[PDB]
Design a protein around this nucleic acid. Structure first.
Ligand SMILES: [Mg+2]
Ligand SMILES: [Mg+2]
Ligand SMILES: [Mg+2]
Ligand SMILES: [Mg+2]
Length: 1336
RNA sequence: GACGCAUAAAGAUGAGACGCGUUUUAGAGCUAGAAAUAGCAAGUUAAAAUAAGGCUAGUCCGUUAUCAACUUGAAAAAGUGGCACCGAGUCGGUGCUU
DNA sequence: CGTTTGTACTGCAGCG
DNA sequence: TCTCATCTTTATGCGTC
DNA sequence: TGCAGTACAAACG
């Protein structure tokens, strides 16, 4: 009467099995509804539920932000048009209309078809006179004539529409740069400031450096070889400070004005300049020189005097494009005329025609044309350009990602300065246009909604419509930025109405040091036993060395405290190993700035210091930090305030101020921190205080502490875990409804947790800085001597990757620079568009252009040749992983492939952990509802939580082998075995219920769970060869009850695993998502195209082509078809696509009449979602997949001897057993060689029954007969692929040894219009069978 | 089985920007030609759209999640389905019973 | 006698 | 691809219910 | 892994 439930929970499936107390799986007869005559079904209470994996919300977030950027960009253009409109009315009234409607064909355009000037001669002359928009922009920048207002608008609109990135702060000005001679201006400035006859007769300037990659070695050798300066400050120490940073934290060289720290032009370099402005302009040339150098790095324009450097570079690309194109055409004509059409006309290939008019990328074009240019004669210049990636460049390419907004801003400023004289309105609102360009909504303000968007936390000072000119006056940035952090920080889990403290807060750090320190035990020779510290001793320790050293080690504690204070010869310290996990880092940081230590020691200012830390943790805007901390002006020096506004803190703790220092025990009056600081002789820590009954903290916590779906909606985190948790709770609820509403005693849950030895644990969690140091010391670079770093800083992903690449780029043989890590990027080897993989094995830090050129592809094979040696050097220095090396050299082993795609992604295991961990507690709280006053919760239902290692070892040890590819019964079987072994362990070890039952309470731990399964074993083999004989019948021990009988229980289990009928049910999901695959196909004369706007006929404009069908609907109606049209009765599936689901559901009958159906019977409309199950002759089951394709739905019940033989025949040499066990398994394989032909007969019979792919069956049998003399291991590991032929799910394609049989998609939803429809309940037990033959 | 701290692996949710790509149109093709065509020369850029759209009209919102049937309820959500045994090719058979 | 339903076989999917 | 911010799962170590 | 396309051949009117 009593029973249990086992669950094997995964990401895309949940398994379930019900067992009685003798491990037998019960079975029952069930009623089946519907109009069919069949009235009862026998089903075994074991099965699996399968569903598509829950998708995460990143795929939605990316599209949503993209839609926001497009919405804001169109509004930028509308703002510019609104500024220009009153003047455009004078010169060309319909010009904005012609631009706006320019996508329409000529017959639909209301105005003249030529957009800009509106007549043929003006338009063609304009395109002759300015071939590209950059010609126009350079002309406007460097011309003083009144230009056409339409041309002005086009230049400004182009600049605003494509405005470059904002990653560079400040006023990086091309206008005060772009001429590299300013080294001479710097040296006469050095002549003015430095008086001991400084060098003015200089040699080679920084041009020789800007020719190649910027480097300290190159720079220093150039400066020494061309400038033997009297001071290394003058020749090196100043010029780097105008052009680079200084590596050490030590002071700079011998000072001229002040010897403090010097650095590159950082965000605080202006306050750094007090080393000269408070002492004495050389450092005024710093901005100019650095901007000129870095802009010369960005752009290949130095000699020209033009004020538009980006446009100069683009026009240079254009003219070199033209010259090299003419030369290439003439050359290919004069040597290879036969290749002329292939290169310059055939746009299907990667020739020049495909590179311009077709879709071939620049890298594909280069790899196509390089063999021709190498074969041909006279193309050395072109080949050199190709190796420099300059041959036939486009103006707008992927490389333009590195152009900053300041260059566009400088060009626009020059344009408006030029044209302010002729048009007054460009001088009146020049600031308005400039703000239209340069404005950007801050990341902490979010979408500017007005209470109708669930993502918006913005709050506003007035109800005005927000424009970029009044954003600062309208949006309350203070409250908005505060809410930007407060809306995501976790509440205190004990006190749910409190926000947690910053992790670097002073109260938190005092809590942590005292909590970790009040439990340390010391012992001396004199006294008897270890005891805790006294309160005064704790006070002395913190005030002596925890307030005066950033970290405290055991040796520091023992010599520095005990050997000098309360002097003892030697003391042993227990409770800490070598160094303390706690620290006072915030206090030390504020001691290095706030020189007044007694101010930090004071108590009345604790609220002030907490407010300071709260501000530094919340706000990171510089002005905002000043606005908030400005109330502390009278407390501190101005320079102190200057240093305080530089210290950024981040990260929030797990506790609240009220919990750690606010609530007081009414008997005593102390808080938690006070009890930690002094509690006499007991010295309880935080938990031991909050759980001590004698204190009011426990009751104050307890007193301070709808549907299941609504609780799930309350649960934060991933939206993917919700599907798994909700499905498994629904399955368990269905089982408890089936079994007479009696709750099971035991529920077994397969946790994916694991135990490891402590050596493997500390190896796999070793310090990241030590990981870097080992490889750096191995390959012998001086990078860590040059650039010190601490393991806390290495949490920066890019700094991590910089050190793992030994400072050098990986795809290109160029050194990186720490100071400009923003200019680089973190590249996935295997791209995001292919496979979700963010492991550090899959991240490489390269230059921006190389990553963006290497789009959605593994590294190119030329790159592989260039850097296979360096990657081998890193692997020998074990900075990279062997998996990282295999990814990096992927191009040699075939490149991208389905072998790479197929597998278990690292995300699914985290998904399994999260789902299963939530399911444990949700099942405990759902089942166990009988609270009590004697004890809080009566454990009516035990939720046993087994680790997967136990059940897997059970399978490996009793030959109940698991093979994934054969069928989907294995989920139900794993659930069944989990239930068996969990109940068996609880019955056999009632003294060991407490570590398995959820809700009761390291090398030893791993050994402890190795021996727990010994009682199942008949014999125990040790390393010494001894054996131990166990009794055939096991007993409970202290109670004497029989639990596990190795005679009959194994027979029962082996009987269950050979069961043929198991309830396999696939979830009937109504599809939702994007309306169609996003590729915009060109125009054709067909109606399968989807119009991408309501006004654009796809036969003229092209559109999307692959629609998703949300759910199919069965219709019975009349259609008007024939040579002479007549009404014909017809019954077929109609696809409802997602773009059109809402329009259907609003009015079904009218919609179907609009489709052309007549006499639709409204009652017979059956919504058939995806995966609906039909049943046909001989039990053939077909799963509906859309409205046209059907999926396979039967499952192969392969016998256990065959399954076990297949697994044992595979893995033939890696059996991991003793030689004798391997030999006996091998001999067993030898003496069942006939099982191969047996299994082939099984596949043949099953496929002829239900798969009905006779051609592929014949091909597979032919392959088997022509491969039947192959080795047995190869034969088994290739016959395991044939089960893809009968596997449940979508039709698929599979290869036997060489013969590749392909996909046989069943594309004919006519046979399922007469079948029997199976509406299956959530578990697969309760069915409803509608006979579709009798409808019509 | 929980929690604090430290180290670490792999992940998650939200925001602010860039670079492209695609589609249609603008960029007069010329020459011999009845021409079916072929020769020649051009080629790089721009506009607009970038889920159809929605209404509270916001410089907002629109791909995550929820979803057997049936009796119901606007829906949230709740209710509905005999048992023993003998057997096993996707479940059957026997016997009881409402 | 003329469609047009039927397999078969291939080919495709925006991105850094 | 870049920038900024938060939370989760787990293994080990120390201390606890 | 559904949908798209290109081809061809039955199979009814
Ligand atoms: Mg599994
Ligand atoms: Mg979904
Ligand atoms: Mg990439
Ligand atoms: Mg733990």
């Amino acid at each position: 009467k009593k029973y249990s439930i086992g669950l094997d929970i995964g990401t895309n499936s949940v398994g379930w099995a019900v067992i009685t107390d003798e491990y037998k799986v019960p079975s029952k007869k069930f009623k089946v509804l519907g109009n069919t005559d069949r009235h009862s079904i026998k089903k075994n209470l074991i099965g699996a539920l399968l569903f598509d994996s829950g998708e995460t919300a990143e795929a939605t977030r990316l599209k949503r932000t993209a839609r926001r950027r497009y919405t804001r960009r169109k509004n930028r253009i509308c703002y510019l048009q609104e500024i220009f409109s009153n003047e455009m009315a004078k010169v060309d009234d319909s010009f904005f209309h012609r631009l706006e409607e320019s996508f329409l064909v000529e017959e639909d355009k209301k105005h003249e078809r030529h957009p800009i000037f509106g007549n043929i001669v003006d338009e063609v002359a304009y395109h002759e006179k300015y071939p590209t928009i950059y010609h126009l922009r350079k002309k406007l920048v460097d011309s003083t004539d009144k230009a056409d207002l339409r041309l002005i608008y086009l230049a400004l609109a182009h600049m605003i529409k494509f405005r470059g990135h904002f990653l560079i702060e400040g006023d990086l000005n091309p206008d005060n740069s772009d001429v590299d001679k300013l080294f001479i201006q710097l040296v006469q400035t050095y002549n003015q400031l430095f008086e001991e006859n400084p060098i003015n007769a200089s040699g080679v300037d920084a041009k020789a450096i800007l020719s190649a990659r910027l480097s300290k070695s190159r720079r220093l050798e150039n400066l020494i070889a061309q400038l033997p300066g009297e001071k290394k400050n003058g020749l090196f120490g100043n010029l780097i400070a105008l052009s680079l940073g200084l590596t050490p934290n030590f002071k700079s060289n011998f000072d001229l004005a002040e010897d403090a720290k010097l650095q590159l032009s950082k965000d605080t370099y202006d306050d750094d300049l007090d080393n000269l402005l408070a002492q004495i302009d050389l450092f005024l040339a710093a901005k100019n020189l650095s901007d000129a150098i870095l802009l010369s790095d960005i752009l290949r324009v130095n000699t020209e005097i033009t004020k538009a450097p980006l446009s100069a570079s683009m026009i240079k690309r254009y003219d070199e494009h033209h010259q090299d194109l003419t030369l290439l055409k003439a050359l290919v004509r004069q040597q290879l005329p036969e290749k002329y059409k292939e290169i310059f006309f055939d746009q299907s290939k990667n020739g020049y025609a495909g590179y311009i008019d077709g879709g071939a990328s620049q890298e594909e074009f280069y790899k196509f044309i390089k063999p021709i240019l190498e074969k041909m004669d006279g193309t050395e210049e072109l080949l050199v350009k190709l190796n420099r990636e300059d041959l036939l460049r486009k103006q707008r390419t992927f490389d333009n990602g590195s152009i900053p907004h300041q260059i566009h801003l400088g060009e626009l400023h020059a344009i408006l300065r030029r044209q302010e004289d002729f048009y007054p309105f460009l001088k009146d609102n020049r600031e308005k246009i400039e703000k239209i360009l340069t404005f950007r909504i801050p990341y902490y303000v979010g979408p500017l909604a007005r209470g109708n968007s669930r993502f918006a936390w913005m709050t506003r000072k007035s109800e005005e419509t927000i424009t970029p000119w009044n954003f600062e006056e309208v949006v309350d940035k203070g409250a908005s930025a505060q809410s930007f952090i407060e809306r995501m920080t976790n509440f205190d889990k004990n006190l749910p109405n409190e926000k947690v403290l910053p992790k670097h807060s002073l109260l938190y750090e005092y809590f942590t040091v005292y909590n970790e320190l009040t439990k340390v035990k010391y012992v001396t020779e004199g006294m008897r036993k270890p005891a805790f510290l006294s309160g005064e001793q704790k006070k002395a320790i913190v005030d002596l060395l925890f307030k005066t050293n950033r970290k405290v080690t055991v040796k520091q504690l023992k010599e520095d405290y005990f050997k000098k204070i309360e002097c003892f010869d030697s003391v042993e310290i227990s409770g800490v190993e070598d160094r303390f996990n706690a620290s006072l880092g915030t206090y030390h940081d504020l001691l290095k700035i706030i020189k007044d230590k007694d101010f930090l020691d004071n108590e009345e200012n604790e609220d002030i210091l907490e407010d300071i830390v709260l501000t530094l943790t919340l706000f990171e805007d510089r002005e905002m930090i000043e606005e908030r901390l400005k109330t502390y002006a009278h407390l501190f020096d101005d320079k102190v305030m200057k240093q305080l506004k530089r210290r950024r803190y981040t990260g929030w703790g797990r506790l609240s101020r009220k919990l750690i220092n606010g609530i007081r025990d009414k008997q005593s009056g102390k808080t938690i921190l006070d009890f930690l600081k002094s509690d006499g002789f007991a010295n309880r820590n935080f938990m031991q205080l909050i759980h001590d009954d004698s204190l009011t903290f426990k009751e104050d916590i307890q007193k301070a502490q709808d549907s299941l779906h609504e609780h799930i909606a309350n649960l934060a985190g991933s939206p993917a875990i919700k599907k798994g948790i909700l499905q498994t709770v629904k399955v368990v609820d269905e089982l408890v409804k089936v079994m007479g509403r009696h709750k099971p005693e035991n529920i077994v849950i397969e946790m994916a947790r694991e135990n490891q030895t402590t050596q493997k644990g500390q190896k796999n969690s070793r310090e990241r800085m030590k990981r870097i140091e080992e490889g750096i010391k191995e390959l012998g670079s001086q990078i860590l001597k040059e650039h010190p770093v601490e393991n806390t800083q290495l949490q920066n992903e890019k700094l991590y990757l910089y050190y793992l690449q030994n400072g050098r780029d990986m795809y290109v043989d160029q050194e990186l620079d720490i100071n400009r890590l923003s200019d680089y990027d973190v590249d996935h080897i295997v791209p995001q568009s292919f496979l979700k993989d963010d492991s550090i094995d899959n991240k490489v830090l390269t230059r921006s252009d190389k990553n963006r050129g290497k789009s959605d592809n593994v590294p190119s094979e030329e790159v592989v040749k260039k850097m296979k040696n360096y990657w081998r050097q890193l692997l020998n220095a074990k900075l990279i992983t062997q998996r990282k090396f295999d990814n990096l050299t992927k191009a040699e082993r075939g490149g991208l492939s389905e072998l790479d795609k197929a597998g278990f992604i690292k995300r699914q295991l985290v998904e399994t952990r999260q789902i299963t961990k939530h399911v444990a507690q949700i099942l405990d709280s759902r089942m166990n509802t009988k609270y009590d006053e004697n004890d809080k919760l009566i454990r009516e239902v035990k939720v046993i939580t087994l680790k997967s290692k136990l059940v897997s070892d059970f399978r490996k040890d009793f030959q109940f082998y698991k093979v994934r590819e054969i069928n989907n019964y294995h989920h139900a079987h794993d659930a069944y075995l989990n239930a068996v072994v969990g109940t068996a362990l609880i019955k056999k070890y009632p003294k060991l219920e407490s570590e398995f039952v959820y809700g009761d309470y390291a090398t030893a731990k791993y050994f402890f769970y190795s021996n727990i399964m010994n009682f199942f074993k008949t014999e125990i083999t040790l390393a010494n060869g001894e054996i131990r004989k166990r009794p055939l019948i096991e007993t409970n021990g202290e109670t004497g009850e029989i639990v596990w009988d190795k005679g009959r229980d194994f027979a029962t289990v082996r009987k269950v695993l050979s069961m043929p009928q198991v309830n396999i049910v696939k979830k009937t999901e109504v599809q939702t998502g994007g309306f169609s695959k996003e590729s915009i196909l060109p125009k054709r004369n067909s109606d399968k195209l989807i119009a991408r706007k309501k006004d654009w006929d796809p036969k003229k404009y092209g559109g999307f082509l692959w629609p998703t069908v949300a759910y199919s609907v069965l219709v019975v109606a009349k259609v008007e078809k024939g040579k002479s049209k007549k009404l014909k009765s017809v019954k077929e599936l109609l696809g409802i696509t997602i773009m059109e689901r809402s329009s259907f559901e609003k009015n079904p009958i009218d919609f179907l009449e609009a489709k052309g159906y007549k006499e639709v019977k409204k009652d017979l409309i059956i919504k058939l979602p995806k995966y609906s199950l039909f049943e046909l002759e001989n039990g053939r089951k077909r799963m509906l997949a859309s409205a046209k394709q059907l999926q396979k739905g039967n499952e192969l019940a392969l016998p256990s001897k065959y399954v076990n033989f297949l697994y044992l025949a595979s893995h033939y040499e890696k059996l991991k057993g003793s030689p004798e066990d391997n030999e006996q398994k091998q001999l067993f394989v030898e003496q069942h060689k006939h099982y191969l032909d047996e299994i082939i007969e099984q596949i043949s019979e099953f496929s002829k029954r239900v798969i009905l792919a006779d051609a592929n069956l014949d091909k597979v049998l032919s392959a088997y007969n022509k491969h039947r003399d192959k080795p047995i291991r190869e034969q088994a590991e290739n016959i395991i692929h044939l089960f893809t032929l009968t596997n449940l799910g979508a039709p698929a394609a599979f290869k036997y040894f060489d013969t590749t049989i392909d996909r046989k998609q069943y594309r004919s939803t006519k046979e399922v219009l007469d079948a029997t429809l199976i509406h299956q309940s959530i578990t697969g037990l309760y069915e409803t069978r509608i006979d579709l033959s009798q409808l019509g």
